[PDB]
Ligand binder design. Sequence first.
Ligand SMILES: C#CCN(Cc1ccc2[nH]c(N)nc(=O)c2c1)c1ccc(C(=O)N[C@@H](CCC(=O)O)C(=O)O)cc1
Ligand SMILES: C#CCN(Cc1ccc2[nH]c(N)nc(=O)c2c1)c1ccc(C(=O)N[C@@H](CCC(=O)O)C(=O)O)cc1
Ligand SMILES: *c1cc(=O)[nH]c(=O)n1[C@H]1C[C@H](O)[C@@H](COP(=O)(O)O)O1
Ligand SMILES: *c1cc(=O)[nH]c(=O)n1[C@H]1C[C@H](O)[C@@H](COP(=O)(O)O)O1
Lengths: 264, 264
Amino acid sequence: MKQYLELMQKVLDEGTQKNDRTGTGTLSIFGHQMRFNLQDGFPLVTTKRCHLRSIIHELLWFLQGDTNIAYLHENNVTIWDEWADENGDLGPVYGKQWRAWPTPDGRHIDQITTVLNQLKNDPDSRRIIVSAWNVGELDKMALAPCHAFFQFYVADGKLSCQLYQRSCDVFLGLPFNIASYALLVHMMAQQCDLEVGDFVWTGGDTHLYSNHMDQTHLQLSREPRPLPKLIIKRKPESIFDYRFEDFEIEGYDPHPGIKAPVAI
Amino acid sequence: MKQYLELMQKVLDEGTQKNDRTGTGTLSIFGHQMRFNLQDGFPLVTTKRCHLRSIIHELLWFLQGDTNIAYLHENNVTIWDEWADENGDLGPVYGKQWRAWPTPDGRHIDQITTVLNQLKNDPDSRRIIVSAWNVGELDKMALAPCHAFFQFYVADGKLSCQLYQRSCDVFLGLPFNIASYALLVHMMAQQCDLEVGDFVWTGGDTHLYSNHMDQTHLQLSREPRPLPKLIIKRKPESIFDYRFEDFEIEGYDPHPGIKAPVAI
Ligand SMILES: C#CCN(Cc1ccc2[nH]c(N)nc(=O)c2c1)c1ccc(C(=O)N[C@@H](CCC(=O)O)C(=O)O)cc1
Ligand SMILES: C#CCN(Cc1ccc2[nH]c(N)nc(=O)c2c1)c1ccc(C(=O)N[C@@H](CCC(=O)O)C(=O)O)cc1
Ligand SMILES: *c1cc(=O)[nH]c(=O)n1[C@H]1C[C@H](O)[C@@H](COP(=O)(O)O)O1
Ligand SMILES: *c1cc(=O)[nH]c(=O)n1[C@H]1C[C@H](O)[C@@H](COP(=O)(O)O)O1
């Protein structure tokens, strides 16, 4: 995508060399924003082939309130393998926080149900937020939340969403993240009888790993193609009733995929 | 300031009319980001006279972990009066969350001290964050956190900070929020022996209240003056030991003040 390739180039041009947690080294910038008019098409990267099944299953897994990779494995999704324990658990990550944020007194808050009811009963609200950044359970998570905070917004019958990503691996994670959130907005809009608006992505530490330089240069030489179109084939009784089988992508004609190692 | 005045014009140029919680009505845009290089000068609005006295006291109050307006009152600051109860309490708002975020297992996390330790021992960390968005305690708060989540970053010996403000009253609140955080960055940098970098402001629902329109156009007809300079006269033993008297703002020649009603 135009704005994705531009960020990719910006990181190369203005990035500072940093020794990161993995000891791999990164080139990074701090503070960046992008906006995607979802009406213009589904923001799935065309300069390299991305696989929807992993994106879709991870999102459905999140909405289930699940934190164990078992489900992901039943569907051949291996993206979280390197951080799960002997028992396949990742800790109280995204899924647990979305559906059952634990209160200090033992209760649990379901942020997704709250958000649904807000979009339906009070769309003008400036508090339609979901946060995965639970400070009191951070030490129990396999990896701290990358996409950690998002807010919904409704104007002119259109639903927009802004994500704050504290840490962003531009080559591997960013394409997944954008598509995952674009997808959720479509599901939310469908469940709330709203049209899709914009997806605004805001990043904190935005980086390119040193061992992704070749892959980046390769990708930067490819011309972006027209964005695909998402089609939801069924309308479930609720936001928790979607299945992988309900999503179809039309007109996705990307450039060949590019392989790259993950920083553990 | 140039960045601030451009934002106002943007809200006016592409904002949508929205109804709101206060019943006032607003002109609103969703998603915006601006950057202030702190080395260029202290970002205190010059197109209208701002009162640094209240900005400073509110910040020291936050750092103390206080949520009762008594302290503010003994210092003649009345900015939080309309939301305080009979006892002057605001509930577990900013001060409490920054200094004592309650965990489900009975602990309390001091996010300010943790951040300070991170800046000293692991400045390259991508997790130097402070969150006021405690989902489990939102129901006890007089008003949900407007400036809800901020992240620090270090590069080239300079300290940067990005704030995600979920709701923003452009005319009244924003000048306060910008100066407040720029002040926090200076204090943090002085404690960690770092230079001041950039302050990146990101907003969710950014709006102008319907009853601030005349004031807004009056302000926009003014030319910004040179930014003032911030001088810290002492280096306290801890970030919690600053006093109002340690700060001095020089070269501040603002245009006349413009009064506007606050929406409760
Ligand atoms: C974001 C996110 C979720 N995640 C989780 C997640 C967890 C830790 C991380 N760590 C680092 N260093 N970068 C990441 O982007 C990252 C992402 C992902 C994990 C792996 C792949 C990945 O290896 N992608 C391959 C496809 C492999 C496959 O289809 O199985 C690719 O080339 O695209 C993508 C996303
Ligand atoms: C942000 C923030 C902190 N706060 C708290 C705070 C709480 C609720 C809010 N509610 C609304 N609708 N807008 C706000 O900006 C806002 C701000 C402020 C509160 C009041 C003023 C205010 O009345 N502005 C006058 C100040 C006069 C005085 O000093 O007493 C001004 O002309 O600036 C500014 C900041
Ligand atoms: C985390 C997972 C995700 O959804 N998106 C991402 O891009 N990432 C990346 C960021 C970073 O490279 C690594 C997480 O490491 P850290 O916690 O920031 O040190 O995965
Ligand atoms: C809240 C407090 C602050 O520091 N700064 C702000 O700009 N505000 C504003 C935002 C909004 O106009 C109102 C809070 O209302 P709501 O919770 O968003 O409905 O005060």
